[PDB]
Design a protein around this ligand. Sequence first.
Ligand SMILES: [Ca+2]
Ligand SMILES: [Ca+2]
Lengths: 139, 63
Amino acid sequence: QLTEEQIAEFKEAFSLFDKDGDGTITTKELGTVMRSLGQNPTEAELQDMINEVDADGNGTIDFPEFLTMMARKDSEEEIREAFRVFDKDGNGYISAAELRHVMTNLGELTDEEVDEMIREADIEGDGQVNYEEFVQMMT
Amino acid sequence: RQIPAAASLIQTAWRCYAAENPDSSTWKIYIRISQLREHHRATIKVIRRMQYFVAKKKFQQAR
Ligand SMILES: [Ca+2]
Ligand SMILES: [Ca+2]
């Protein structure tokens, strides 16, 4: 279940996005929050975000939809198969160099963040990033 | 191809898992908020989570 205190906690979070206290979260309102925390998202990104959480398709997120998403948990398999995209020839391992380059230059991550990543996975140098280990750690 | 979709899912997942460390490197990135406070961390987590799900859909479209 969710707890009485938990539901309160989520209501707080929801209000931090819902600037106009009108019971829903717009793209503009989410963009505002994100820009407030120093990000420069495209309205494309904001729409994609809202669509992942918008159930009834009204274009805004209501509180039900919000606590549905906060309560969302197969994802192990998805993340494992993501690492496979970079697995030279189905090793099971990824070179830490390859991991770092992907993690920094492709996609979304900082050198510090990736240092944490590699430090949480490598078994000395040898056993270069066994991604099965990553996937299990995250789940 | 699915190289950027792949990467954004691993990255997205990790910043989620890492945010749950009250003391991760992941936190440093937010360089416009002087000292990170409660509500800051709340909105952050909310957003990382939301990005997770987006990356999870985009990768499902690529798989
Ligand atoms: Ca609103
Ligand atoms: Ca809605």
